[PDB]
């Protein structure tokens, strides 16, 4: 299938939660909420999160 | 759904609750997508009106346009809200939301 | 007077990247997610025909000028809490100048 | 502040592989621009696009930036 | 080991002793892993975030 149809393969960024011993970075989580609320939340629902 | 499809030129914004798990690459794909928006589609790409070119999206034609730009948010904790810094942060929140 | 004339070249692209994908500046009435803005300055808020503005935009009846435009763009949602406009806003003053400065050399 | 992914995409766009890759890409775009003017491009069903080359470029930069980017982020 | 013959003395460990240790282990082992886990992830945890707030 043409490379374009598949879509470019996303590289692997070194996430701080990747790792059998790593937890999510909650501070980063908090920031992300704000980003969602002020930028994404105008078009994206988050129906499953109470 | 109709109201939603109306406000986005026929397209329908998926609920982000499980998007990290509902895609291949997860955190990586989500992030590379939010950032992956070139300013001009590669030469020869006939792009449908109302569409935007993103290479990481299958088929190249995604209905969502670039929305993340530098400093468009004032992080309460001080952190410089660069476009890739914001991308990293939602994706981590979206990952939590899903898992 | 809280408006300085920036550049119409910076505003052209500030618009391209953050407004263009919903708004059209040329003559006529080609409405997209937002109504086409040709002759929006001096006009009231929610006038352009062929468009179905929310109850909120019409209700405020804002006379459009450089100073209201710069205060709306600060927070389109704080200005009119019921606007269907999906936009966070331009936090930096300089950017609203260059932006609105483009709208005079365009929506004219 | 200048975005960290851009700063890196720029530094890597200007390396040997970087300049070689953008060249092959630009030599393609330039080849298409011609076709578009030529007699009846609208009717050809063969139209070349430069996605393949844009991908090799983009891929390269991904490989270079990805393991680095997050050290610059908070 | 003669360390064994001091406790059980040539006998297998009895079912009661076993069960008893199961309770002790269960509680200890947890605190241990939890402690090592929380420590290894300092700064990322909510407690750590709440301090900086
Ligand atoms: C309305 C202006 C939007 C804003 C603001 C954001 N998104 Fe969006 N998103 C929107 C549409 C119209 C679509 C559908 C496009 C399609 O062709 O299907 C989307 C889609 C996404 C997706 C999933 C895309 C896919 O892989 O199929 C993601 C991953 C996504 N959007 C994420 C996202 C985030 C995190 C946002 C805030 C930073 C965000 N979107 C804002 C419309 C809009
Ligand atoms: C689509 C996601 C948009 C983007 C990005 C921009 N605008 Fe918008 N705008 C949009 C909608 C859906 C509406 C209607 C809201 C309503 O209350 O009915 C609007 C409205 C405006 C208005 C009011 C028009 C009037 O006649 O009173 C203004 C002044 C306006 N928008 C300006 C504007 C500019 C120049 C933008 C970039 C900073 C911009 N909008 C982007 C949808 C969208």
From Swiss-Prot, chain B:
Subunit text: Component of the ubiquinol-cytochrome c oxidoreductase (cytochrome b-c1 complex, complex III, CIII), a multisubunit enzyme composed of 10 subunits. The complex is composed of 3 respiratory subunits cytochrome b (COB), cytochrome c1 (CYT1) and Rieske protein (RIP1), 2 core protein subunits COR1 and QCR2, and 5 low-molecular weight protein subunits QCR6, QCR7, QCR8, QCR9 and QCR10.
GO molecular function list: heme binding; metal ion binding; ubiquinol-cytochrome-c reductase activity
Cellular compartment(s): Mitochondrion inner membrane
Function in brief: Component of the ubiquinol-cytochrome c oxidoreductase, a multisubunit transmembrane complex that is part of the mitochondrial electron transport chain which drives oxidative phosphorylation.
Biological process according to GO: cellular respiration; mitochondrial electron transport, ubiquinol to cytochrome c
Lineage of the organism: Eukaryota, Fungi, Dikarya, Ascomycota, Saccharomycotina
GO cellular component, one term: mitochondrial inner membrane
Name of the protein this chain belongs to: Cytochrome c1, heme protein, mitochondrial
Sequence positions that bind heme c: 64
Misc remark: Present with 39900 molecules/cell in log phase SD medium.
Included range, full protein: 162 to 260 of 309
Keywords annotated in UniProt: Electron transport, Heme, Iron, Membrane, Metal-binding, Mitochondrion, Mitochondrion inner membrane, Respiratory chain, Transit peptide, Translocase, Transmembrane, Transmembrane helix, Transport
Keyword field contains rRNA-binding: no
Family: Belongs to the cytochrome c family.
Organism: Saccharomyces cerevisiae (strain ATCC 204508 / S288c)
Curated annotation (Swiss-Prot), chain C:
Cofactors: heme c
GO biological process, one term: mitochondrial electron transport, ubiquinol to cytochrome c
GO molecular function: cardiolipin binding; electron transfer activity; heme binding; metal ion binding
Keywords: Electron transport, Heme, Iron, Metal-binding, Methylation, Mitochondrion, Respiratory chain, Transport
InterPro entries from the UniProt entry: Cyt_c-like_dom (IPR009056), Cyt_c-like_dom_sf (IPR036909), Cyt_c_1A/1B (IPR002327)
Superkingdom of source: Eukaryota
Coiled coil: none
Positions of transmembrane segments: none
Chain positions with N6,N6,N6-trimethyllysine modification: 77-78
Known outcome of mutating residue 77 to R: Loss of methylation by CTM1
Keyword Thylakoid: no
Protein's cellular compartments: Mitochondrion intermembrane space
Induction or repression: By oxygen at the level of transcription. Expression drops rapidly when the oxygen concentration falls below 0.5 uM O(2).
Main location: mitochondrion
Keyword Signal: no
Additional observations: Present with 7330 molecules/cell in log phase SD medium.
Family: Belongs to the cytochrome c family.
Protein name: Cytochrome c isoform 1
Organism per entry: Saccharomyces cerevisiae (strain ATCC 204508 / S288c)
UniProtKB/Swiss-Prot annotation, chain D:
Domain of life: Eukaryota
Entry's localization field: Mitochondrion inner membrane
Chain intervals with Basic and acidic residues compositional bias: 6-16
Annotated disulfide bonds: 28-50
One GO CC term, this protein: respiratory chain complex III
Coiled-coil annotated residue ranges, if any: none
Topology relative to the membrane: Peripheral membrane protein
Keywords in alphabetical order: Disulfide bond, Electron transport, Membrane, Mitochondrion, Mitochondrion inner membrane, Respiratory chain, Transport
Main location: mitochondrion
GO biological process, one term: cellular respiration
Record's function text: Component of the ubiquinol-cytochrome c oxidoreductase, a multisubunit transmembrane complex that is part of the mitochondrial electron transport chain which drives oxidative phosphorylation.
Family label: Belongs to the UQCRH/QCR6 family.
Other facts: Present with 4490 molecules/cell in log phase SD medium.
Quaternary structure annotation from Swiss-Prot or TrEMBL: Component of the ubiquinol-cytochrome c oxidoreductase (cytochrome b-c1 complex, complex III, CIII), a multisubunit enzyme composed of 10 subunits. The complex is composed of 3 respiratory subunits cytochrome b (COB), cytochrome c1 (CYT1) and Rieske protein (RIP1), 2 core protein subunits COR1 and QCR2, and 5 low-molecular weight protein subunits QCR6, QCR7, QCR8, QCR9 and QCR10.
Protein name as it appears in the record: Cytochrome b-c1 complex subunit 6, mitochondrial
Gene name of the encoded protein: QCR6
UniProtKB/Swiss-Prot annotation, chain E:
Record flagged with keyword Electron transport: yes
TM region(s), chain numbering: 15-40
Transmembrane found in the keyword field: yes
Topological domains annotated Mitochondrial matrix: 1-14
Membrane topology: Single-pass membrane protein
Domain of life assignment: Eukaryota
Keywords: Electron transport, Membrane, Mitochondrion, Mitochondrion inner membrane, Respiratory chain, Transmembrane, Transmembrane helix, Transport
Compartment(s) of residence: Mitochondrion inner membrane
GO annotation (BP), single: mitochondrial respiratory chain complex III assembly
GO cellular component assignments: mitochondrial inner membrane; mitochondrion; respiratory chain complex III
Function: Component of the ubiquinol-cytochrome c oxidoreductase, a multisubunit transmembrane complex that is part of the mitochondrial electron transport chain which drives oxidative phosphorylation.
Subunit structure as annotated in this protein's UniProt entry: Component of the ubiquinol-cytochrome c oxidoreductase (cytochrome b-c1 complex, complex III, CIII), a multisubunit enzyme composed of 10 subunits. The complex is composed of 3 respiratory subunits cytochrome b (COB), cytochrome c1 (CYT1) and Rieske protein (RIP1), 2 core protein subunits COR1 and QCR2, and 5 low-molecular weight protein subunits QCR6, QCR7, QCR8, QCR9 and QCR10.
Similarity comment: Belongs to the UQCR10/QCR9 family.
Other notes: Present with 4550 molecules/cell in log phase SD medium.
UniProt protein name: Cytochrome b-c1 complex subunit 9, mitochondrial
Gene name for this UniProt entry: QCR9
Residues of the full protein shown: 4 to 56 of 66
